[PDB]
């Protein structure tokens, strides 16, 4: 969406709160293990098939091979998809680290408003008015900046997720 719909306090506080990337990183690890195991699974399956093909090599076994072909393809594709997950999770964690880093620190915002208020209190003669306007422009710049950061964050995450395609149901062997 458009995150400039929200003030710097919201975008900054939002990106700075939360538990952090750890649970994602753990998930990445897990997805890697899966990627390994299932690859092994694939390799065993195709070995087993071959073994059968070697042991009998009759028309019946060839029929079985033809029957199991779509499941073999499916298992292969499954492994290909599995290999992507860790990659994309790390892309996402990266995107988060960069958003977290590029976002305007809350203290700079707070400081802006505080300085503005100090000028207001002292403005009885009106001579600080332009400076107050300047501080307002700086605040708007924080607004815009957080906007851009959240835009890029969204785009990166979106691009990463787009690469994780839907799991498909395995075909029957028959």
């Amino acid at each position: 969406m458009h995150f400039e719909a929200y003030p710097p306090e919201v975008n900054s506080a939002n990106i700075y709160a939360g538990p952090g990337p750890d649970s994602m990183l753990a998930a990445a690890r897990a997805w890697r293990s899966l990627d390994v195991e299932m690859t092994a699974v694939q390799r065993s399956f195709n070995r087993t098939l071959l073994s059968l093909m070697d042991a009998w090599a009759g028309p019946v076994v060839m029929q079985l091979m033809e029957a199991a072909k779509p499941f073999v393809r499916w298992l292969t594709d499954l492994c290909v998809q599995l290999s992507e997950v860790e990659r994309q999770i790390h892309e996402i964690v990266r995107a988060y680290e960069w958003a977290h880093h590029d976002m305007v620190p809350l203290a700079q915002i707070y400081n802006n408003r505080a300085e503005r208020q100090i000028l207001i209190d002292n403005n009885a003669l009106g001579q600080f008015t332009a400076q107050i306007a300047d501080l307002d422009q700086e605040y708007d710049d924080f607004w815009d900046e957080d906007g851009e950061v959240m835009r890029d964050y969204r785009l990166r995450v979106s691009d990463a997720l787009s690469k994780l395609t839907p799991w498909k149901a395995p075909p029957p062997i028959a």
């Binding site: 458009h2 009885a124 003669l125 001579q127 008015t129 400076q131 307002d136 605040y139 906007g147």
Partner: protein
């Protein structure tokens, strides 16, 4: 007949989005526009339809003249701002606990005028309440600007110039004395410090009243842009209507060798107001205001 245009804050934002304008003067107090990968994500929603009916938007395109004025607001060479208020000028501050962070509201008693000049083109943007009116405005000399300001202020409240002897007083000394005087709520009995500075009793009284309980206030200041940078006018003209009449407060420009600044406390007489506007325009950082442009080469 009439070339003026009026939109609310969101309508102005839709204009920004269509014309790809990141920001305008902070005094207008809109929200920024950040371009995403899709501008169809603000869609056509009814805020746009209203503008289609007003001739502001033709098809998916903005009206050409309006687009030009918005261009002027987007990247002006010169900006001239006036903050006007009925009663005390709060400079955008609304004291409420329910005001959201980065609220785009302005105080009900307040309205702000931004005169932008891009090239030879002058465009007015007036923010009253939640409404912004953009139009063409004619400006030539300091006096004409002073005229626009005076009209705007007189429409809020009518006041005759205070009767006082105009005087120049050292800036920071005046700030300190005024800051101490503010603690007593500008009581005329507590104005001994200002009387020591050589300010007349009548001036201390009229100023005391103007600061204590103004009927209407105006703050006029300017901004100049060059290349990547920008700067504010060193001086600000402040009109304040007290029960003892209207007062003008503006600093005189510093010497080439500088060393200190002077604050001018004057009656609101049109001559002195022309002077105030002229000094505000002459305290700008880059060159003369009238002919300047932000492009160096």
């Amino acid at each position: 007949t009439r070339t003026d245009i009026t939109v609310n804050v969101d309508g102005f934002w839709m204009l920004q989005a269509l014309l790809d304008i990141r920001h305008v003067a902070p005094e207008l107090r809109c929200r920024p526009y950040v371009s995403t990968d899709s501008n169809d994500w603000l869609n056509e929603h009814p805020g746009m339809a209203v503008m289609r009916e007003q001739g502001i938007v033709v098809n998916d395109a903005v009206n050409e003249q309006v687009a030009a004025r918005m261009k002027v607001l987007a990247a002006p060479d010169l900006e001239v701002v006036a903050l006007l208020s009925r009663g005390k000028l709060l400079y955008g501050v609304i004291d409420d606990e329910n005001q959201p962070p980065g609220s785009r509201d302005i105080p009900d008693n307040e309205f702000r005028v931004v005169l932008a000049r891009r090239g030879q083109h002058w465009v007015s943007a007036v923010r009253v309440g939640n409404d912004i009116t953009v139009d063409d405005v004619t400006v030539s000399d300091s006096a004409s600007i002073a005229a626009l300001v005076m009209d705007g202020l007189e429409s809020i409240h009518h006041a005759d110039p205070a009767a006082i002897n105009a005087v120049n007083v050292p800036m920071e000394e005046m700030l300190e004395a005024t800051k101490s005087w503010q603690e007593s709520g500008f009581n005329v009995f507590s104005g001994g410090d200002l009387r020591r500075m050589g300010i007349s009793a009548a001036t201390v009284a009229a100023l005391g009243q103007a600061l204590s309980d103004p009927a209407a206030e105006v703050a006029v200041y300017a901004r100049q842009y060059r290349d990547d940078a920008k700067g504010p006018s060193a001086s600000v003209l402040s009109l304040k209507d007290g029960s003892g009449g209207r007062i003008a407060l503006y600093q005189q420009a510093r010497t080439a060798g500088s060393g200190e600044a002077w604050l001018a406390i004057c009656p609101a007489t049109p001559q002195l107001v022309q002077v105030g506007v002229k000094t505000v325009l002459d305290t700008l950082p880059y060159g003369e205001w009238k002919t300047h442009s932000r492009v160096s080469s």
